Coordinates of C-alpha atoms and ligand atoms in Angstrom, one line a residue:
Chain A
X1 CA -110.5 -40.0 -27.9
X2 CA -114.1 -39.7 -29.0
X3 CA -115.4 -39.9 -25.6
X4 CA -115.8 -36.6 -22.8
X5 CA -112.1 -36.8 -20.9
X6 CA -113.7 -37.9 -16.9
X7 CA -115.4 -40.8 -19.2
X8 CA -112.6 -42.0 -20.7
X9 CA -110.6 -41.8 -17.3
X10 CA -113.5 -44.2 -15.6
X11 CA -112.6 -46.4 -18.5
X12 CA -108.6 -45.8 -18.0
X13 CA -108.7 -46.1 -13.9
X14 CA -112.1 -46.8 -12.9
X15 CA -113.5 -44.9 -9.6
Chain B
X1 CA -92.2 -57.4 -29.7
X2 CA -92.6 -61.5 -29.3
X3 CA -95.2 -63.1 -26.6
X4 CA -94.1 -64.1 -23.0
X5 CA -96.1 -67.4 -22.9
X6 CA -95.9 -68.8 -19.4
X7 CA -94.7 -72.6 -19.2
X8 CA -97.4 -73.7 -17.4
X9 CA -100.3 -72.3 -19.9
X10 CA -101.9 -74.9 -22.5
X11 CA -101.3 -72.7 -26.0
X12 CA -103.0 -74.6 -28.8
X13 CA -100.7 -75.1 -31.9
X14 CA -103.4 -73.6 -34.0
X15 CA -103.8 -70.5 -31.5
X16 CA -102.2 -67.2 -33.3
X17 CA -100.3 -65.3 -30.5
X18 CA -98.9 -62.6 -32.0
X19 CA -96.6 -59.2 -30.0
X20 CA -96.4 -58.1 -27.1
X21 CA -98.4 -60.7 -25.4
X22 CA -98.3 -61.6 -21.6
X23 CA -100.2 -65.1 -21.2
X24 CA -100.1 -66.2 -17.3
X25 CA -99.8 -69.6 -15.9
X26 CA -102.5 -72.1 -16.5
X27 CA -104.4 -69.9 -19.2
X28 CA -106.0 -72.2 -21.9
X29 CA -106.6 -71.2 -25.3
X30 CA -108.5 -72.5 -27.9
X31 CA -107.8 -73.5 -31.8
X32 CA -109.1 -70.8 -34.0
X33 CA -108.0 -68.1 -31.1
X34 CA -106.2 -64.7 -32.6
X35 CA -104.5 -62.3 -30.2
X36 CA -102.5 -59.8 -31.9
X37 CA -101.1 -57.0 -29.9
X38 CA -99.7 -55.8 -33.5
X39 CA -101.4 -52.6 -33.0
X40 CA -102.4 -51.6 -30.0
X41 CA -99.9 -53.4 -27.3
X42 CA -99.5 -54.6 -24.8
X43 CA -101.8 -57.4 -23.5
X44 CA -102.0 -59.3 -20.5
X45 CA -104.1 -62.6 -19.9
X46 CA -103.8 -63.3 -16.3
X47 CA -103.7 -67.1 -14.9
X48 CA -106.0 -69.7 -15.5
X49 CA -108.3 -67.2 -17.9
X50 CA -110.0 -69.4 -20.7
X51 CA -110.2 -68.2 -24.5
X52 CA -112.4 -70.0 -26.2
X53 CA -112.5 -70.6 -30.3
X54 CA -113.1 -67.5 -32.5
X55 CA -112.6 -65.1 -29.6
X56 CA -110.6 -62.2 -31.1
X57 CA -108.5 -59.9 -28.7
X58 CA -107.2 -57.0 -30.7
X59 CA -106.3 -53.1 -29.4
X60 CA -106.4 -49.6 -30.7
X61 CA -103.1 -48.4 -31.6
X62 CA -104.0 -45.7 -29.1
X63 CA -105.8 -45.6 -25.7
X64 CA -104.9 -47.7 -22.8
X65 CA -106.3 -49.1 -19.3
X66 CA -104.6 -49.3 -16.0
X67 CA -103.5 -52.8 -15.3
X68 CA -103.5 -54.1 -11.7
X69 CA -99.7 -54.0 -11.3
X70 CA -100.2 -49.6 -12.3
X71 CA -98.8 -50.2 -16.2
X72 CA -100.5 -49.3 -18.9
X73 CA -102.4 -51.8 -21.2
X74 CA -104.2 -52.0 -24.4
X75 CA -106.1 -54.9 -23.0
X76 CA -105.7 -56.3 -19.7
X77 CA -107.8 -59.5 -18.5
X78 CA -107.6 -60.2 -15.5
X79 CA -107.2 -64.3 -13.6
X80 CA -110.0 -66.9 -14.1
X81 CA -111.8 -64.7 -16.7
X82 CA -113.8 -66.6 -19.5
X83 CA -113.8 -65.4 -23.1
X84 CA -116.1 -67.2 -24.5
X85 CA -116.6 -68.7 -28.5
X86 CA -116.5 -66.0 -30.9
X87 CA -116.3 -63.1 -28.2
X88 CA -114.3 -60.1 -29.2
X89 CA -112.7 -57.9 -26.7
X90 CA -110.9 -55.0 -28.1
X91 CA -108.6 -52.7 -26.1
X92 CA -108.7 -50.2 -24.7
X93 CA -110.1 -53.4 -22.4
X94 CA -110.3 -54.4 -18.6
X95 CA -111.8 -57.0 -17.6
X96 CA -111.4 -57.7 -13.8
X97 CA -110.7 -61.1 -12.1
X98 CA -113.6 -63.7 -12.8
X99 CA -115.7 -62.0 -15.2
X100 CA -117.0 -64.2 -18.2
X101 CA -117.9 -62.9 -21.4
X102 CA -120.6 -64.8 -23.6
X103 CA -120.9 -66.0 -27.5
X104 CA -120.5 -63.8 -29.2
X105 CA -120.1 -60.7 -26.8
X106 CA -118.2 -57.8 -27.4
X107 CA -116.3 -55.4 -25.3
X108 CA -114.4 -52.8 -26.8
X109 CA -113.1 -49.4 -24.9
X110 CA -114.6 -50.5 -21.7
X111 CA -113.7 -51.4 -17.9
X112 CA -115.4 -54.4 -16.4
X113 CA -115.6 -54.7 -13.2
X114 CA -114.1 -58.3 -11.2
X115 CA -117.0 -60.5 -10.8
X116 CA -119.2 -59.2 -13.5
X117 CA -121.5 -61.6 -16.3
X118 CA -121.8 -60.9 -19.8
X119 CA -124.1 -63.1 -21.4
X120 CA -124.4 -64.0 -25.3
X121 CA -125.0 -61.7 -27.8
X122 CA -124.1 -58.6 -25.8
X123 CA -122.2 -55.3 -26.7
X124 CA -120.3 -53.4 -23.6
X125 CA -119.0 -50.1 -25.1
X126 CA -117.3 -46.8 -23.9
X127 CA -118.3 -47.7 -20.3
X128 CA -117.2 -48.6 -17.0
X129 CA -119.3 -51.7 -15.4
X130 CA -118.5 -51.7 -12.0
X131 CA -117.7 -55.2 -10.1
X132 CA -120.4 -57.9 -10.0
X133 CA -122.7 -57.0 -12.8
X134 CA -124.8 -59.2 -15.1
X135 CA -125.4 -57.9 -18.6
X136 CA -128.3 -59.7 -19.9
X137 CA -128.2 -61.8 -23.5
X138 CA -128.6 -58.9 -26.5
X139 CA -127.6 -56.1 -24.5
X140 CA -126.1 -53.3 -25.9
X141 CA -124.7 -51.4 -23.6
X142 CA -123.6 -48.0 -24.8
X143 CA -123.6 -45.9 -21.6
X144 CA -122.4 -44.7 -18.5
X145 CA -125.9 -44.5 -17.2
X146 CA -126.9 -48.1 -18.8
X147 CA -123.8 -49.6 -17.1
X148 CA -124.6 -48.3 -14.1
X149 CA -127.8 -49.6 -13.4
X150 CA -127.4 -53.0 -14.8
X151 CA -128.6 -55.4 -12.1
X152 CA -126.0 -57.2 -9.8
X153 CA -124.9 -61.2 -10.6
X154 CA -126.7 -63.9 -8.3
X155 CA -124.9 -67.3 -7.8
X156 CA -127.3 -69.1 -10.0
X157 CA -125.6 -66.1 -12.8
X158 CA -121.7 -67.5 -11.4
X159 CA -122.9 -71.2 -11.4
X160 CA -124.0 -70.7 -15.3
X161 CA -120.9 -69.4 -16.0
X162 CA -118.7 -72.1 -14.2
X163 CA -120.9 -74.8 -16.3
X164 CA -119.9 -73.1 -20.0
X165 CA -116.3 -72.7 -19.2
Chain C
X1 CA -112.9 -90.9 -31.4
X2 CA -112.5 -90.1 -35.4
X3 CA -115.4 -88.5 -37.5
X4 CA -117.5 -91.3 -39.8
X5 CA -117.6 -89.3 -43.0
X6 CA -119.7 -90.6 -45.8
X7 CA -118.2 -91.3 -49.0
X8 CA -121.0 -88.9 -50.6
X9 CA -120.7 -86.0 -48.0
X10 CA -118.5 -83.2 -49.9
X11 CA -116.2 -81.7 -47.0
X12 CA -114.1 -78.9 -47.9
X13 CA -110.2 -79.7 -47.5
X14 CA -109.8 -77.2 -45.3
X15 CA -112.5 -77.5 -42.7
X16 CA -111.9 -79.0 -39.6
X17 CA -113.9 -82.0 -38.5
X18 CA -112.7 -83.6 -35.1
X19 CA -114.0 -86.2 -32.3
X20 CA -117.0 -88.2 -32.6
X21 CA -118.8 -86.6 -35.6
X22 CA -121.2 -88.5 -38.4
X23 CA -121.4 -86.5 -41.3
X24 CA -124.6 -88.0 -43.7
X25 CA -124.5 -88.6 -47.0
X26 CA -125.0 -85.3 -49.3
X27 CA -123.5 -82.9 -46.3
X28 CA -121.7 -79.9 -48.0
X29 CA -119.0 -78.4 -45.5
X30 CA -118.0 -75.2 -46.6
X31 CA -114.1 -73.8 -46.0
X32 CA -113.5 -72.5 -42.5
X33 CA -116.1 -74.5 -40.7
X34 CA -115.3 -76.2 -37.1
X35 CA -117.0 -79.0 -36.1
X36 CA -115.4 -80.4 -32.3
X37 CA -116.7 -82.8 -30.5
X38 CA -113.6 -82.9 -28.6
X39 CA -115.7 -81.7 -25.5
X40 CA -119.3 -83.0 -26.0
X41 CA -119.9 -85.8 -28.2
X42 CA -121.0 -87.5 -30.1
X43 CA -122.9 -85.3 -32.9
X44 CA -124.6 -86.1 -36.0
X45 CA -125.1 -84.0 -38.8
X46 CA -128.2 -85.4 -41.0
X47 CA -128.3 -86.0 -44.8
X48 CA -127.7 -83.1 -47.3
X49 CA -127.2 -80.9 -44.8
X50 CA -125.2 -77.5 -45.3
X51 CA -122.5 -75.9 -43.2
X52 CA -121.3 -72.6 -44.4
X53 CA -118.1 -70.7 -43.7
X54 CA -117.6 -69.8 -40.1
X55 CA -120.0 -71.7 -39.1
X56 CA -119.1 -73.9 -35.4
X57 CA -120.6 -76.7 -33.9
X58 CA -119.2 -77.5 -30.3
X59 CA -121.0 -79.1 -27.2
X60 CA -120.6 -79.0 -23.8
X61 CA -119.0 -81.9 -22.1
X62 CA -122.4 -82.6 -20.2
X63 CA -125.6 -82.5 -21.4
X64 CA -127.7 -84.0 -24.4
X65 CA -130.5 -84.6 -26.6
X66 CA -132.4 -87.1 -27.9
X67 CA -131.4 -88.5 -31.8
X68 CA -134.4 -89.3 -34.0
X69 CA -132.5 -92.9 -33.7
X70 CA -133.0 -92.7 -30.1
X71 CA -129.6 -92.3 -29.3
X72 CA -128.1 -89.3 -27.1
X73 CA -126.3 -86.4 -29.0
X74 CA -124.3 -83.6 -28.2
X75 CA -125.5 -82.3 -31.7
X76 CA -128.5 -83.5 -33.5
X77 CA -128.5 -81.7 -36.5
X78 CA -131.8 -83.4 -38.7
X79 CA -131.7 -83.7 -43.0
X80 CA -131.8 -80.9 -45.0
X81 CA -130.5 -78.5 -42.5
X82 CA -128.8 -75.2 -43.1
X83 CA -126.5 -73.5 -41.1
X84 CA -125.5 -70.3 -42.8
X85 CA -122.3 -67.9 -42.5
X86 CA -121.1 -67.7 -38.6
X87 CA -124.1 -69.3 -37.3
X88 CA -123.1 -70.8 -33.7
X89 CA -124.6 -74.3 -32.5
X90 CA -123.7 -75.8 -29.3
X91 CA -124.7 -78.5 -27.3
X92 CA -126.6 -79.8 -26.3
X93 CA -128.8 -78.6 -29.5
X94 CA -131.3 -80.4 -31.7
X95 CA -132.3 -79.0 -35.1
X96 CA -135.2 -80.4 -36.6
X97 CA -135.5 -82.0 -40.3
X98 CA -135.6 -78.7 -42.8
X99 CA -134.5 -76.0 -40.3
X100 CA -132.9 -73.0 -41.5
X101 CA -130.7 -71.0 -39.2
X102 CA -129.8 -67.8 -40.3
X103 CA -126.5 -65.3 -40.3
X104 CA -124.3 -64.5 -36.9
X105 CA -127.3 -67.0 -35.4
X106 CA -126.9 -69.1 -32.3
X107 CA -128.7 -72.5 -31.4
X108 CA -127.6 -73.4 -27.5
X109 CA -129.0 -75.4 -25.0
X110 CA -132.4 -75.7 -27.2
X111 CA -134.5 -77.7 -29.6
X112 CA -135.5 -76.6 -32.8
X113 CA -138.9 -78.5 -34.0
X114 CA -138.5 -79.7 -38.1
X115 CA -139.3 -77.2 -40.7
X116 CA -138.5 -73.9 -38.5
X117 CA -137.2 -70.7 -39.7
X118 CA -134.3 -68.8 -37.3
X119 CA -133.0 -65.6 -39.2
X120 CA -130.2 -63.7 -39.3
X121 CA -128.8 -62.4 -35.9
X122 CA -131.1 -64.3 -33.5
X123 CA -130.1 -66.5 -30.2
X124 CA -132.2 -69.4 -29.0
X125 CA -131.2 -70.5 -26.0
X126 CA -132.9 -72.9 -23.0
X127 CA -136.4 -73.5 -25.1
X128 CA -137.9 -75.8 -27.1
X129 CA -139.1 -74.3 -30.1
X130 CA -141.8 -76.1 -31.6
X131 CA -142.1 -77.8 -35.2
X132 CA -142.5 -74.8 -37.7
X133 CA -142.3 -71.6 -36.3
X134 CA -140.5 -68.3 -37.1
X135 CA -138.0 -66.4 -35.3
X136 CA -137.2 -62.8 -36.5
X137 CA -134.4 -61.1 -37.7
X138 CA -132.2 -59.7 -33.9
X139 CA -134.3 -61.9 -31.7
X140 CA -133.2 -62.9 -28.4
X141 CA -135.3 -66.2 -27.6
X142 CA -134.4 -66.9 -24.3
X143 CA -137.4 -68.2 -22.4
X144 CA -139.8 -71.1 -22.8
X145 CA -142.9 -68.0 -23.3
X146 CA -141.2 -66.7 -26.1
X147 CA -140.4 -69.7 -28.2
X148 CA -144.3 -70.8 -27.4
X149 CA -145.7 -68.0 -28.8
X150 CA -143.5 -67.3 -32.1
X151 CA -145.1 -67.4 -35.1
X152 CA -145.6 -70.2 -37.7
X153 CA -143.0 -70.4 -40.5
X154 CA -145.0 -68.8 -43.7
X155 CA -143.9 -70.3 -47.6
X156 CA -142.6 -66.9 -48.6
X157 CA -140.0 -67.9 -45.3
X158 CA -139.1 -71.6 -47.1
X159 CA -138.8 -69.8 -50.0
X160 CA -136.4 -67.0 -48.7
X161 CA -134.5 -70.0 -47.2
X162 CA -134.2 -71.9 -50.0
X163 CA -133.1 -68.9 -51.3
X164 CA -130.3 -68.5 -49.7
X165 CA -128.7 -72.0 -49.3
Chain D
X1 CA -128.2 -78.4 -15.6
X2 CA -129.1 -74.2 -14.9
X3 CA -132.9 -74.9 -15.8
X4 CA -135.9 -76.7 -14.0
X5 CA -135.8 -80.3 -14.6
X6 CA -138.7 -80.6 -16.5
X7 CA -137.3 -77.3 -18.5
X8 CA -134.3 -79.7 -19.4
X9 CA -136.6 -82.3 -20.3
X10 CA -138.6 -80.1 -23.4
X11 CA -135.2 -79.3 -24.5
X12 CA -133.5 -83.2 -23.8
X13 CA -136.7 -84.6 -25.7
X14 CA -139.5 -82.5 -26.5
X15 CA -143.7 -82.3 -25.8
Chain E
X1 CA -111.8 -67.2 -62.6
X2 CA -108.7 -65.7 -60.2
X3 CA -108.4 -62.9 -58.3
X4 CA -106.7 -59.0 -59.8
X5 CA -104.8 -57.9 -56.9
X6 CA -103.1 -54.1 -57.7
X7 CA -99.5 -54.2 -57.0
X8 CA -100.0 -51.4 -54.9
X9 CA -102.6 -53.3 -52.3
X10 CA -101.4 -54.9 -49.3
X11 CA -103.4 -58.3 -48.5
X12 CA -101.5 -60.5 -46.2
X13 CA -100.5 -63.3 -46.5
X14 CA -103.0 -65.6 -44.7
X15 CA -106.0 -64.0 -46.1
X16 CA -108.3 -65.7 -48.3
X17 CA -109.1 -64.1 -51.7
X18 CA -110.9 -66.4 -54.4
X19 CA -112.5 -66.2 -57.5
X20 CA -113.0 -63.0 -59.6
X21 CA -112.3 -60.3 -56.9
X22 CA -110.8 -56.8 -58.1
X23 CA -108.5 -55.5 -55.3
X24 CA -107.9 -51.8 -56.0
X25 CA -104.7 -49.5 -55.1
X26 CA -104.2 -48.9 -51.3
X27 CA -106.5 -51.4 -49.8
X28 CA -105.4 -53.1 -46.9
X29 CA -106.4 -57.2 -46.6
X30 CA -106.1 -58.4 -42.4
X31 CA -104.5 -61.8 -42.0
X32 CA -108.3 -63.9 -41.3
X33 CA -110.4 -62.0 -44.2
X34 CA -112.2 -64.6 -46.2
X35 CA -113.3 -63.0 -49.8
X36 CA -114.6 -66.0 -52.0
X37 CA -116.5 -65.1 -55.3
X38 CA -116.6 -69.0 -56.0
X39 CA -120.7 -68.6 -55.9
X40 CA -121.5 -65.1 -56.3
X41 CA -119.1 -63.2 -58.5
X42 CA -117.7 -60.6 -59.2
X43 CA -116.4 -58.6 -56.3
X44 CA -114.7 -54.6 -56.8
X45 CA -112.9 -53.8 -53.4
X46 CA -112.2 -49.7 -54.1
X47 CA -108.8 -47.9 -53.6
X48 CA -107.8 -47.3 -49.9
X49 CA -110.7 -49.6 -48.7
X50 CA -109.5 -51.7 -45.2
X51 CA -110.9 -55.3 -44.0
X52 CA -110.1 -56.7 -40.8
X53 CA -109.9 -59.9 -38.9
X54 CA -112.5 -61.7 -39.0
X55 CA -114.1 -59.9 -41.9
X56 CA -116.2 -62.4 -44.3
X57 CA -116.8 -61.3 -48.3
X58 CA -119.8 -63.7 -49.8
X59 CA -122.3 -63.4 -52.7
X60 CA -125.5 -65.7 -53.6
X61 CA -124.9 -66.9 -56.7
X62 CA -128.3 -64.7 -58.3
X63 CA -128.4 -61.2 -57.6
X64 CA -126.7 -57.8 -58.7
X65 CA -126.2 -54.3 -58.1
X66 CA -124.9 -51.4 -60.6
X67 CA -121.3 -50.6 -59.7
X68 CA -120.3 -46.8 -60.3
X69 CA -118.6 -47.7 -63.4
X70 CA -122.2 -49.2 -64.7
X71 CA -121.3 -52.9 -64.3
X72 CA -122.9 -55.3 -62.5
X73 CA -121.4 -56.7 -59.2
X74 CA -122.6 -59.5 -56.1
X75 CA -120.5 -57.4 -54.2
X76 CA -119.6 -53.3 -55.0
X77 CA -117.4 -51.6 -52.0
X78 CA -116.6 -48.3 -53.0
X79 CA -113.2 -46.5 -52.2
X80 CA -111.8 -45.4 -48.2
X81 CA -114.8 -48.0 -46.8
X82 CA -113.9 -49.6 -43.8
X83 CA -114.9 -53.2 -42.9
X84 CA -113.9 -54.1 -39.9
X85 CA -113.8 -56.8 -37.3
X86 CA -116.3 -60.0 -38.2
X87 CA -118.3 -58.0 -40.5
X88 CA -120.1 -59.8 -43.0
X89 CA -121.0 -58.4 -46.4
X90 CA -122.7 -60.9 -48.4
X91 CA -124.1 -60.0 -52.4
X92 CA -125.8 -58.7 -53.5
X93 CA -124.3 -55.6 -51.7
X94 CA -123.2 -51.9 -52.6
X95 CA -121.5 -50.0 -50.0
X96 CA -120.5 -46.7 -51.2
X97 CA -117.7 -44.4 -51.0
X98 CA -116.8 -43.4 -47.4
X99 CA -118.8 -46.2 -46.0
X100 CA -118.0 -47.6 -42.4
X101 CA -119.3 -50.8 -41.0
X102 CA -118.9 -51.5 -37.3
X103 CA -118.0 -54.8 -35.5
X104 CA -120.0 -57.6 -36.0
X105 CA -121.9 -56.1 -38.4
X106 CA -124.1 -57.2 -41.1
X107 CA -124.6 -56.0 -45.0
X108 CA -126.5 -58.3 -46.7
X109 CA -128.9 -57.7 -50.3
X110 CA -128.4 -53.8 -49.4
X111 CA -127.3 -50.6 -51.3
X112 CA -125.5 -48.1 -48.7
X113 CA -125.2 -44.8 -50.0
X114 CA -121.6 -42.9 -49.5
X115 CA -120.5 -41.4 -46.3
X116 CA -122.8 -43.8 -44.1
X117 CA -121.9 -45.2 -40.6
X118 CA -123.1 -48.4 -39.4
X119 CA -122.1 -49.1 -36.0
X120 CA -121.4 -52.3 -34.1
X121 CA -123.7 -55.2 -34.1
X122 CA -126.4 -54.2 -36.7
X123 CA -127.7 -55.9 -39.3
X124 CA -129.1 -54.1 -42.7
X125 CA -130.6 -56.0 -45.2
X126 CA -133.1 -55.6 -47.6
X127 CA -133.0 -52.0 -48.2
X128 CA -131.4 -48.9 -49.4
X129 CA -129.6 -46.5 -47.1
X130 CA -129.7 -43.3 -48.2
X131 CA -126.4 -41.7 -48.7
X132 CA -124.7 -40.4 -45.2
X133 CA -126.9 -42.1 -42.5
X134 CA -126.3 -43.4 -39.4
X135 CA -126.8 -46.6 -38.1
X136 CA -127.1 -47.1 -34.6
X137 CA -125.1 -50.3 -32.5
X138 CA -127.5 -53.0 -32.0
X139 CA -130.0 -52.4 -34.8
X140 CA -132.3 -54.5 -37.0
X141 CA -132.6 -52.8 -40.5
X142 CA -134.7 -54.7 -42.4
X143 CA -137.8 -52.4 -44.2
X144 CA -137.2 -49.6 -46.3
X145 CA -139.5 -47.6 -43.8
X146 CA -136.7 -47.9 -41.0
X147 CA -134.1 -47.2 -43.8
X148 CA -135.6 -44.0 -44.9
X149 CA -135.7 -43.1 -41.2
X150 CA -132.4 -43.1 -40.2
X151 CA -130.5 -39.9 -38.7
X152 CA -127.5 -38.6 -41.0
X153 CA -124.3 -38.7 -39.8
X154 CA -122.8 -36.3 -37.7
X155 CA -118.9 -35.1 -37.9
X156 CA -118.4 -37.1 -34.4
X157 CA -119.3 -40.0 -36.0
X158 CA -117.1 -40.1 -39.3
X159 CA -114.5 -38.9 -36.3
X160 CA -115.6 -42.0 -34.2
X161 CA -114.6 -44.0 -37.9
X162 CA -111.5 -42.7 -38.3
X163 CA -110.6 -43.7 -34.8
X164 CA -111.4 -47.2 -35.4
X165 CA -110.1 -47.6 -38.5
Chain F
X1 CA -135.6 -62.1 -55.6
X2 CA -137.7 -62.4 -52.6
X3 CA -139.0 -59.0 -52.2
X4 CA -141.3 -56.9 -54.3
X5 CA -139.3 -55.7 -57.7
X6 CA -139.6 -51.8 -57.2
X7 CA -137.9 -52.8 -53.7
X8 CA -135.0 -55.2 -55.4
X9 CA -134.4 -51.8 -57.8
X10 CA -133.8 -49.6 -55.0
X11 CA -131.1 -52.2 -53.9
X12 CA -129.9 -53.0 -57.5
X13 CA -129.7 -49.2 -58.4
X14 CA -131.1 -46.9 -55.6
X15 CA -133.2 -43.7 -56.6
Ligands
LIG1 CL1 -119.9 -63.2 -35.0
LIG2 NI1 -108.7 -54.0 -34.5
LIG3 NI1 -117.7 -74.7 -26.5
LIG4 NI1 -122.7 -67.3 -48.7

């Protein structure tokens, strides 16, 4: 995406 | 490739449900409502959430959420969530049980935590908003760091939300 | 429980008027407007008024204002008043004789005094604004402070509106 | 309403 | 008086073209898009240009800008521009080759020069974006000061557009 | 227009 990958993951999953 | 649309929702005839479209018991949605999982897919609208006219929920062909049942979503809304007139949530979506979303607020590629208040004119982008969070009217919230320090919701916040629904 | 349309109102064929509405004589209703008082009724909409496309009026089931005719309203929407392209007004929500109210602009839960001025992208929400005053382009009016202290409407502001009805 | 009374009242009828 | 659509575009079927609107080769028309050049005409929509849902095409009847083939248009989008969900763009309006314009956003008596990125939730009107500048979510463009101002675009951003597009 | 000429030319044209 356009976003760093552990940002995109607190979007995917959450923490 | 066609919406499940549960027996027990109230569909208006007007409504454009379109793909691969989950819509849970009890879910109302307005005339003048567009849900097309045409791109991104699929979409669930868990029970008794509330669309309201000129809300929009449309996805990315890619990039998905984690649904609470551990499947993979362009947008997932949650039960008892208001979408509000002329909102727009765009997967990749989550918005977690009870959340409302204002006029003409927007949340696109964003996790919202259960609980949480967006009020009108609001943007929520490329961030997570963790449970019980009011986003003030005009916010644009563009952040990690902005979502994280947004102020918690107060029951006068829940109470305003239960009278717009 | 049907809309009172008068024979010199034009109403495009293809917006939708429904519930208790009064449309004046001289109203222009543009395509793709929603006008609902299927919720919150009744409204009025005040002689040679203008609607534009995507423009809504709803109201919310409870809650009014007082008419000019001293009748309650959902909707009081005064003569001459314009409500441009996607502008959002929802009861309970009094517009004044001669207001203008800009693009993507919301009117909710608020009175608007005659002969004021909302541009484009602006919410007014909870206040009273008085008779004549301004509010800028991306405001977010939210409190009874604010719309005390906005700024009287100008002629170059009449003229802008005028402009663009 | 959400607001003070008298809040509702500016809004219901005006100054 | 009606519409030239290229053979080669693909409008759907439940969008709204009117009036004397050009459609060029490639361009994509969501079901929802409202283009009317019934006040303000005419409209050029360049080759490969996309509109989304929601997306609103409007002119005021007075008022020009110099297409790129030296005629006068309400409304001039350039080729590969991207219009996407609610945006308005209302003549007299020039967006040039390359341009992007994010949800919910706002072109309105503006020229924006090639290769610009307007984000979500912004308004521009009244001035002239230089070519390849950014526009930030949420902002109020309305002087030529702030226009001249702006921060060119960046590859992540044209990036960030092809994403959404 | 409603703005100052040289301004409407910048949107009519640009520079
Ligand atoms: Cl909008
Ligand atoms: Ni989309
Ligand atoms: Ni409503
Ligand atoms: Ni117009």
């Amino acid at each position: 995406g356009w976003l760093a990958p552990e940002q995109q993951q607190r979007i995917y999953r959450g923490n | 490739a066609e919406p499940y649309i549960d027996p027990a929702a109230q569909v208006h005839a007007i409504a454009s449900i379109i793909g691969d479209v989950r819509i849970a018991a009890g879910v109302r949605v307005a005339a003048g409502v567009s849900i097309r999982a045409d791109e991104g897919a699929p979409f669930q609208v868990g029970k008794e959430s509330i669309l309201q006219e000129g809300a929009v929920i449309h996805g990315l062909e890619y990039g998905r959420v984690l649904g609470d049942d551990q499947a993979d979503y362009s947008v997932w809304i949650g039960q008892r969530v208001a979408i509000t007139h002329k909102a727009l949530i765009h997967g990749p979506a989550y918005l977690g049980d009870d959340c409302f979303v204002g006029f003409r607020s927007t949340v696109f590629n964003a996790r919202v935590g259960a609980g949480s208040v967006i009020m009108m004119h609001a943007l929520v982008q490329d961030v997570e908003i963790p449970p019980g969070r009011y986003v003030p009217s005009g916010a644009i919230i563009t952040t990690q760091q902005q979502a994280d320090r947004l102020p918690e919701v107060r029951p006068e916040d829940r109470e305003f939300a239960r009278h717009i629904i």
